[PDB]
Nucleic acid binder design. Structure first.
Ligand SMILES: [Mg+2]
Ligand SMILES: [Mg+2]
Ligand SMILES: [Mg+2]
Lengths: 384, 134, 196
RNA sequence: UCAGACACCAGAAAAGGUGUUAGUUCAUCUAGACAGCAGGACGGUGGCCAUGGAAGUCGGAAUCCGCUAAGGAGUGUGUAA
RNA sequence: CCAAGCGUUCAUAGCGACGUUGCUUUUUGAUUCUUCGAUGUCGGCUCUUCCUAUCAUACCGAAGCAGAAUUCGGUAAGCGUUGGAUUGUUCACCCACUAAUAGGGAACGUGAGCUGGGUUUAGACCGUCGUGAGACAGGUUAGUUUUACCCUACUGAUGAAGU
RNA sequence: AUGCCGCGGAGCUAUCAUCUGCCGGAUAACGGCUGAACGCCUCUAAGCCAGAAUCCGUGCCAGAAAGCGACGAUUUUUUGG
């Protein structure tokens, strides 16, 4: 009596710690053979958040042709390197990996992924495989041919160039990225040609595209039911504590039910958030990364003082609208959308008017070093 | 409902039992919020109002004729800061409303003090009697 | 009089429970059994009634922890395996060992498509069901309760049938040459007087 | 689309079913049964009150003759009646 | 189920007596089979789940121009079912909002979960009763709410290897 | 026993802040098609469509610690392999 909806979703169970950190693509987009060959996912690094001003183009809206302010998330996306290919055969027990073909040479950062102590090891990871590649170059072609004959699904092995980021970790992140497009033979040919080659973010995604972001959320440790599940605080008078659930079950079933809120792990969980819109695909080689057609000031996408706990973004980046799972510097998986988008909100072209680059280490008031120097004039340190 | 269109979500500042100034010359001074129109169902949650919202109120201080009865009113100012779609967080010095009939027509004829833009766009009778808007 | 080590049964066209009871008894006698093409099994009764029976089965879950609950397998060979397990004393070692001597599969995977496949006449639909009695196929029931592999099994079965037809054609030709060289033999007369 | 499955016993009723099977009665039946079915359905009479018109085919009260295979003051379609 | 009838006219649009066949009861009662070397006792709060006898939401059917309003009518419990004044309360009525403010079960769900307003018979006052000690289809006020460190369950956390 | 007051980065946090939250299949009620029996009629007799917030899936979470696959390197000139 006095009904209320249950607290939290039974679809996100169990609330254990994720068995991974990277962020796993659970489902790739349906393959269309009529399209050209392309990648369906990319790996980036969460650099930080800022906000933009843009003019809204939404007829029928009170804010049509008016300025809106929006929080955005900046993900640093240097080009990934294709290092291999995996073929999967359709079977009555699911997809099965038939075989995996690697590039002749693998860089050190990807080879660090195969070790817990790369430095102390003998660095013997693909040394015998590499010799096979340069003996006759015939077992490589045979393995690729078998993927063409069998293997309805083809995925490239691609790794990040984490050394180009300011991260202290040297071990690169490696993932299977499904190749969608025309024909299994063309997938394998495309993959072989990209061995040891870079694929960059603008060849995967485009401006205004709607994508999904997959990552592991911020760790929270344990939490009681009040914060883990949102249960009501018990009264001040409650003996033996109030941050709990008063009644965790009836008589009969003489057992605690799985649907009752319990204290436990409250973070570090795997989530795929849908419908993040790409507001900008920045280029790491141009000094007007954060400039607009209305803000001509030559500035890049790094706030004053650098991204807090990240550093300077010197590579390509994406400027998704809103929030993403996980903390600054966690690797995030960007995936092509499984849905079709025809709504006006999804289809509207996005043209930014201004990107904030003030310090996020406080109440920063200057967008650029030059603006700070002009407003304040000269200081005791500036003169000498 | 059927004011002039729609209103964006605004931080609610005036729950039930809140008392706000009467910003009009209807003879009232002390609107006491009893209910908020459009409030759905949520256990233990108090109905609460923001600027532009129609509420039901009683008059606690003012002309004896206006008291002891429930009347509609519109919130025109609030102290809790809310966020405009252009990213501005704004707030007023006080909480005020004006007595209206269900259609939204003002019982009084003049409004003292500023009036929120959200209230003005929704209710043209309030906009006609408003002085400075925002 | 079938005491062979392993028998492979083509489940196509057999009635679920009647085949299940025969197989279960054979397992308890120490026979290794392979049941192939479990998607082609039949159950008597119209489709809707049999679908409702599985849906009622799917409701039965442990109230306080469904991960303990009855585990409802959707694939056709798992539906058959459940029928066989119910006819074995599976909570004893003897029943468990009997159940482990069964291998039920969808389609005809590569170990068994080059082996002889037999049928069980006591369980054949055409012999047991009156004509005009409605019946359903297990593969269709499975596909509407969550089984995902109707299409890949069907495609692989068409490919297997093409190869088997080629194998059969080659064997037909070889047997014809042997039979011609047999009926022309002079020793046929003395074999006739013996019934051969 | 809730089958049923064995005494005690662990549920059941009234009443119903173009369910299904099987059997009974009145009786239309080579004097041409039913459905399919071609037809006819004369005049008194447009029966008395009813009314702007109401001739069966919108109402009140009543149900007859000569002949014929066939005729009753009527089932209607539509008709401004 | 029956059909005398209301329903200008049509016995069953919607109403529908006398009878008759069933379901349920959360009603006290009936009984006394379990418990008197002891199963904590109302309500509220909190929290979960189940049933459908459907208030709202989805799709359908019938009566008459639409417009609606009723039969929520038939499927259907997926998803909702509120804020207050009061009642110790259950119930209930009232002010409102709301798409709507449906009814039930879970040891009359839920006290090593709380709270303790109810009950709470030790202190005390009153009314009626009693010669009195004292009593009560009553009223009133004050009155200690213990323990998990075991097993399981549940929530999270590690983890051996013959293959 | 943080003496008190203003501001206070970082972090944490707010329905006091911002972001994001699909479409496939089978059905129920109920409605049509081909068509009978009961020579006509009629959604039913077999069947074929259409059809609900229903059900089952894809999608999302876990991942069998006794379900599984692909791949890499295999104690190094001591000693083990
Ligand atoms: Mg206490
Ligand atoms: Mg900051
Ligand atoms: Mg409450």
């Amino acid at each position: 009596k006095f009904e209320q909806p249950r607290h939290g979703s039974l679809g996100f169970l169990p609330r254990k710690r994720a068995s991974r950190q990277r962020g796993k693509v659970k489902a790739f987009p349906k393959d269309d053979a009529s399209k050209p060959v392309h990648l369906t996912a990319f790996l980036g690094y969460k650099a930080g958040m800022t906000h933009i001003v843009r003019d809204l183009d939404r007829p029928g809206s009170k804010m049509h042709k008016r300025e809106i302010l929006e929080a955005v998330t900046v993900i640093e996306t240097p080009p990934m390197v294709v290092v291999g290919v995996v073929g999967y055969v359709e079977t009555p027990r699911g997809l099965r990996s038939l075989t995996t073909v690697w590039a002749e040479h693998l860089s050190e950062e990807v080879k660090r992924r195969f070790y817990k102590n790369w430095f102390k090891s003998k660095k013997k990871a693909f040394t015998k495989y590499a010799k096979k590649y340069a003996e006759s170059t015939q077992s490589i072609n045979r393995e690729l041919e078998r993927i063409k004959k069998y293997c309805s699904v083809v995925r490239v092995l691609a790794h990040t160039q984490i050394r180009k980021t300011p991260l202290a970790q040297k071990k690169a992140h490696l993932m299977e990225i499904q190749v969608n497009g025309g024909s299994v033979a063309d997938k394998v040919e495309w993959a072989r040609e990209h061995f040891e080659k870079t694929v960059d973010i603008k060849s995967t995604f485009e401006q205004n595209e709607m994508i999904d972001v997959i990552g592991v959320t911020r760790g929270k440790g344990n939490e009681g039911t009040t914060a883990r599940w949102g249960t009501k605080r018990l009264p001040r008078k409650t003996h033996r504590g109030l941050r709990k659930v008063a009644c965790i079950g009836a008589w009969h079933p003489a057992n605690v039910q799985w649907t009752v809120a319990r204290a436990g792990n409250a973070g570090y969980m795997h989530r795929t958030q849908l419908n993040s819109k790409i507001y900008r695909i920045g280029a790491g080689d141009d000094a007007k990364n954060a400039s607009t057609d209305f803000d001509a000031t030559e500035k890049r996408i790094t706030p004053m003082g650098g991204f807090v706990r990240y550093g300077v973004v010197e590579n390509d980046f994406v400027m998704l609208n809103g929030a993403t799972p996980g903390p600054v510097k966690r690797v995030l998986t960007l995936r092509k959308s499984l849905l079709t988008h025809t709504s006006r909100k999804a289809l509207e072209p996005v043209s930014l008017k201004w990107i904030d680059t003030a310090s996020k280490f406080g109440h920063g008031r200057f967008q650029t070093p030059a603006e700070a120097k002009q407003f304040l004039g000269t200081l005791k340190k500036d003169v000498a | 409902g059927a004011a002039s269109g729609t209103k964006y979500r605004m931080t609610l500042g005036l729950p039930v039992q809140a008392i706000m100034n009467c910003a009009d010359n209807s003879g009232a001074k002390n609107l006491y919020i009893v209910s908020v129109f459009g409030t759905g169902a949520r256990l233990n949650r108090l109905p609460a109002a923001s600027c532009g919202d129609m509420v039901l109120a009683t008059v606690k201080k003012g002309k004896p004729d206006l008291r002891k009865k429930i009347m509609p009113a519109i919130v025109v100012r609030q102290r809790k800061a809310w966020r405009r779609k252009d990213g501005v967080y704004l707030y007023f010095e006080d909480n005020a409303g004006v007595i209206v009939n269900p259609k939204g027509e003002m019982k009084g004829s003049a409004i003292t003090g500023p009036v929120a833009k959200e209230c003005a766009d929704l209710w043209p009778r309030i906009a006609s009697n408003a002085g400075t808007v925002v | 009089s079938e005491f062979q080590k392993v028998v492979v049964i083509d489940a196509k066209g057999h009635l679920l429970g009647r085949l299940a009871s025969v197989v279960a008894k054979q397992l308890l006698g120490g026979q290794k059994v392979v049941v192939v093409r479990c998607e082609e099994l039949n159950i008597s009764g119209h489709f809707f009634r049999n679908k409702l029976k599985y849906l009622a089965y799917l409701r039965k879950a442990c109230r306080y922890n469904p991960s303990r609950g009855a585990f409802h397998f959707r694939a056709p060979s798992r539906i058959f395996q459940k029928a066989v397990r119910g006819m074995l004393p599976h909570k004893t070692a003897r029943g468990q060992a009997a159940l482990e001597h069964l291998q039920a599969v969808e389609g005809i995977p590569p170990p068994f498509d080059k082996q002889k496949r037999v049928v069980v006449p006591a369980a054949l639909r055409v012999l047991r069901l009156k004509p005009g009695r409605k019946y359903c196929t297990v593969g269709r029931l499975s596909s509407e309760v969550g089984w995902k592999y109707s299409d890949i099994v069907s495609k692989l079965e068409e490919r297997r049938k093409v190869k088997s037809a080629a194998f059969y054609q080659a064997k037909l030709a070889k047997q014809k040459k042997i039979a011609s060289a047999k009926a022309a033999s002079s020793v046929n007369g003395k074999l006739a007087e013996f019934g051969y």
